[PDB]
Design a protein around this nucleic acid. Structure first.
Lengths: 96, 125, 242, 84, 92, 198
RNA sequence: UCUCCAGGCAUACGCGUAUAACAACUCGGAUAACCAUUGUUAGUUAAUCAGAAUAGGCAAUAAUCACACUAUAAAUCA
RNA sequence: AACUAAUCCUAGCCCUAGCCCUACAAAUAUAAUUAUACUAUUAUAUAAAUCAAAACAUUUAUAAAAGUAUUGGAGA
């Protein structure tokens, strides 16, 4: 909130966080995992991996067809600006 | 969420939403004598009483009527072997009264021979 | 331990590495080169030999330049190599007399000079020697451009030199506006000082200014890795098509 | 056993957010039980449960962070979420 | 008071390579046609290789040899020590 | 801190290494990870000790002290449960053996053959005897906790096997925060005003 | 329960867990009992108690139970 | 053969040699470490003296030629 004149507290609804609680009904993931389940080797996701998985197939097909141009870079997923999104990648304007 | 940066708000700015919560709370049996509906909770010092109200109402769907909170000073008198003062982490105690006439009661968790001494009994000789 | 390189060589190492190495070669040459200022208050010894007092034999002689203090105000003005001489004096020019602390002040003045290249009259601190040098240089603009930094002895003069050199280099229409014919004559008149635009920019720049300039030149907005991968993907695919 | 990072990566973005609260709920219950044990001066049964939940929660956070970090680099090229 | 325990037994080899080869080429000058002076074989601080002097001379020579490479703290300490040494020898 | 047979951080370890202790540190010759060749379950022959010449299987390895423990070998007898009421019960307790005090055993021929580390076709490192070159396969050791992964049965709050193995991630041009919004349909039209980062 | 003594309670300031319960009897109280000591655990709850927009226009006449009444040390943003 | 005590070797250091150097979150110069506006923001003249000249005053160091000559209360 914000303290206005006269030493009076004025709570701001926007600045008050709202807890987004997921629905756990039908969700099969639980706090613990089976010892029967093999441990997973860590393979952290990277920009190259994300680009290869999603963006590369689109460009590869388009490039062979020849329908590739700078103006359509956004079509493959480029964002000219982070404004307009509730969650902005940079500068980070959203909380966890 | 604790130990994180919160977005600065400006006129016309979005409502603040916390999709992932880092606040962790513990239900504690009241140290003092309190009404049954009243419940004591140990919560991070950065959490506000309003946050607890939303936290219980949303995450745990618990109706809350009134909340009273206190900050407990951690004693720093304790010293180590080097005579360096050790400070107990400060914790916040929240007294939450249930709504809709609900009442709470703390669960009952954690419900040789004497005649011949000095000669080992092994000897048969 | 002990430093392998002396303190004076530490500066050389920095100049040879890092952003200093990335600095333009022309500017680096200007910084590296040192030119002795023209003597003003001291003259070289007339004779090259003298009788050594200790051994009673003729010996080679050396020249000791007189110490002269140039205040920063000179760097904001156009002094003709004159400077404040601080020291001691013996009254009547005999060592037998009393020693009096004396500060010798050259007569300083503030006067206005017209610059053809900039087409403006500048009022600046100047000495009589500079005015004679300006006449000897065949114009105020010539004096700034012809005179080297050390002989010029003025940061503002170097600032004028940077602007004059850049103005001549670019053939900028800003010279003598609405008089294109007059503009050509000035450029032809000062054609001797025409140089590449890049060199003229760095003339007279201070070390702190130069480092910031190179930092500003080399700072570039981070490349979105999406774009980098897109170009890399297209380049590899294009090569495969070949 | 606690959730491993790779398994969490296999799970969807929505699933990861759902799982985080599930782990948090268990962590709070274990924390709630532990604090009562401290008051009662008694040991906590199966203390490894809390460690497993915390390990799973830590794995969840990095996996989510990895996806966010990768996209930020792609769209903007900045290696840090905060300008500096 | 004195030890109540025996020290570890020690045996020293007098025919080790270092002792066995000690002194070799000490006659390099006379036996090497004087191309290399035996002083050239001295290993030690640069300012006193093939040179000897009193404590004051050694310190002064050290200052000149590595003054440009000496630390400011070391240089300041050496100057203060030199001043005390200079007064003592030259006035007492 | 002097490493002992007691596990580090245990109550016995605290007695062995009290905070005020400043005893002379014990020097143990460092052994590289590649150099080390002894692992739990390895059949080795005791070069020297109480049971020198008796081959045993390793059960504990304190690499900090280069100590190898063989079950049922170099075993001394000590009193467990000593109390005021009862004298105690004699038990056989193993003593640490240094790495040089044991050597690996060739399976076909039981001898203390010196070994050299070399890779295999699969790429797993295997110790190879310097003489009579042969592959000493890594031994199988039971899980210390005693939990057999297959035998384990899911308890409360434990996911079923199939649930963990299910993969639901679909690569897409959206962050997790954005993905959650789509599923729950969160929409926000308000925009933060310009903020000067500095 | 009896005998006798007569600065007590709140706030400020300062102090910072010395608070309370349990368990100890070694150390601290210049001796014991008992703790102010040692170990562990608990504690002080506030919409009422306390702390944390701008530009113009315009002002003669103290208080003293403020009326009378005087006085001199000259004493009220809206 | 007793008490009080004593016993010990590594905790580490020193000098040369070698070598220049380029080793979490959150909060912070506001009142440092106070998550957002206040209030503009800023070092340094010969180094001196002490000291030596038995005080004190000009003065007083900080490869060979060679401690030769000059200089100097011709004295340290």
């Amino acid at each position: 909130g914000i303290y206005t004149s006269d030493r009076k507290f004025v709570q701001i609804k926007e600045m008050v966080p709202e807890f987004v609680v997921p629905d756990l009904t039908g969700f099969k993931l639980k706090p613990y995992v089976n010892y029967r389940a093999p441990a997973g080797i860590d393979t952290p996701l990277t920009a190259k991996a994300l680009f290869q998985e999603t963006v590369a197939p689109a460009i590869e097909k388009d490039f062979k067809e020849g329908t590739f141009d700078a103006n359509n870079l956004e079509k493959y997923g480029f964002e000219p600006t982070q404004e307009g999104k509730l969650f902005q990648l940079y500068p980070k304007n959203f909380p966890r | 969420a604790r130990n994180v940066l919160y977005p600065l708000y400006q006129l016309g700015g979005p409502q603040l939403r916390v999709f992932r919560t880092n606040f962790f709370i513990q239900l504690v049996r009241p140290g003092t004598a309190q009404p049954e509906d009243t419940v004591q909770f140990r919560i991070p010092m950065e959490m506000t009483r309003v946050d607890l109200r939303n936290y219980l109402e949303q995450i745990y769907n618990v109706p809350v009527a009134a909340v009273r909170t206190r900050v407990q000073h951690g004693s720093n008198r304790r010293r180590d072997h080097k005579n360096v003062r050790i400070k107990k982490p400060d914790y916040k105690v929240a007294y939450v009264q249930l709504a809709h006439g609900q009442t709470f009661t703390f669960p009952d968790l954690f419900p040789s021979d004497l005649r011949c001494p000095g000669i080992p009994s092994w000897f048969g000789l | 331990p002990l430093h392998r390189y002396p303190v004076h060589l530490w500066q050389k190492l920095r100049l040879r590495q890092g952003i200093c190495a990335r600095l333009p070669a022309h500017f680096l040459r200007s910084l590296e080169e040192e030119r002795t200022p023209t003597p003003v208050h001291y003259k070289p010894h007339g004779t090259k030999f003298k009788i050594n007092p200790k051994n009673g034999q003729r010996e080679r002689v050396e020249d000791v330049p007189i110490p002269v203090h140039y205040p920063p105000e000179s760097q904001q003005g156009l002094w003709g190599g004159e400077g404040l001489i601080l020291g001691y004096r013996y009254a009547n020019n005999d060592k037998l007399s009393k020693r009096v602390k004396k500060v010798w002040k050259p007569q300083l003045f503030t006067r206005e000079l017209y610059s053809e290249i900039l087409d403006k009259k500048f009022t600046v601190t100047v000495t009589m020697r500079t005015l004679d040098l300006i006449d000897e240089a065949y114009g105020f603009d010539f004096y700034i451009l012809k005179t080297p930094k050390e002989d010029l002895g003025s940061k503002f003069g170097m600032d004028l030199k940077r602007g004059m050199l850049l103005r001549l280099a670019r053939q900028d229409p800003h010279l003598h506006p609405e008089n294109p014919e007059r503009r050509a004559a000035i450029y032809d008149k000062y054609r001797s000082f025409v140089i590449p635009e890049a060199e003229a920019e760095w003339v007279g720049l201070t070390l702190e200014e130069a480092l910031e300039k190179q930092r500003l030149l080399e700072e570039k907005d981070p490349v979105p890795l999406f774009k980098v991968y897109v170009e890399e993907l297209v380049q590899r695919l294009q090569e495969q098509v070949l | 056993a606690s959730w491993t990072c790779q398994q969490l990566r296999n799970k969807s973005n929505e699933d990861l957010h759902k799982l985080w609260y599930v782990l948090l709920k268990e962590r709070n219950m274990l924390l709630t039980l532990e604090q009562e044990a401290k008051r009662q001066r008694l040991p906590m049964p199966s203390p490894e449960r809390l460690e497993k939940v915390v390990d799973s929660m830590d794995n969840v956070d990095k996996v989510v962070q990895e996806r966010e970090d990768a996209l930020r680099l792609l769209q903007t090229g900045q290696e840090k979420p905060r300008p500096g | 008071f004195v030890r109540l325990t025996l020290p570890p037994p020690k045996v020293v080899d007098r025919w080790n390579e270092k002792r066995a080869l000690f002194g070799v080429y000490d006659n390099i000058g006379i036996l090497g046609n004087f191309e290399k002076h035996p002083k050239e074989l001295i290993k030690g601080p640069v300012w006193l290789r093939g040179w000897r002097g009193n404590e004051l001379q050694r310190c002064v020579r050290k200052k000149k040899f590595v003054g440009n490479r000496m630390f400011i703290e070391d240089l300041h300490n050496l100057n203060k020590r030199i001043s005390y040494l200079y007064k003592h020898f030259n006035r007492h | 801190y002097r490493y002992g047979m007691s596990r580090p951080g245990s109550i016995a370890d605290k007695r062995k290494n009290p905070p005020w202790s400043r005893r002379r540190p014990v020097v143990v010759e460092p052994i590289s990870d590649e150099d080390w060749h002894l692992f739990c379950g390895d059949m080795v022959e005791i070069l020297e000790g109480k049971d020198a010449g008796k081959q045993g299987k390793v059960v504990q390895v304190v690499r900090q002290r280069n100590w190898v423990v063989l079950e049922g070998l170099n075993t001394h007898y000590r009193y467990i449960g000593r109390t005021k009421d009862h004298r105690g019960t004699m038990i056989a307790s193993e003593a640490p053996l240094l790495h040089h005090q044991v050597k690996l055993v060739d399976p076909v021929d039981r001898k203390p053959t010196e070994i050299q580390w070399r890779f295999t076709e699969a790429g797993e490192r295997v110790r190879v005897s310097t003489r009579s070159g042969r592959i000493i396969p890594k031994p199988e050791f039971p899980r210390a906790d005693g939990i057999v992964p297959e035998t384990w049965t899911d308890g409360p709050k434990d996911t079923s096997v199939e649930d963990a193995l299910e993969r639901t991630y679909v690569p897409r041009l959206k962050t997790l925060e954005e993905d959650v919004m789509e599923a729950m349909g969160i929409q926000e039209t308000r925009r933060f005003k310009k903020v000067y980062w500095y």
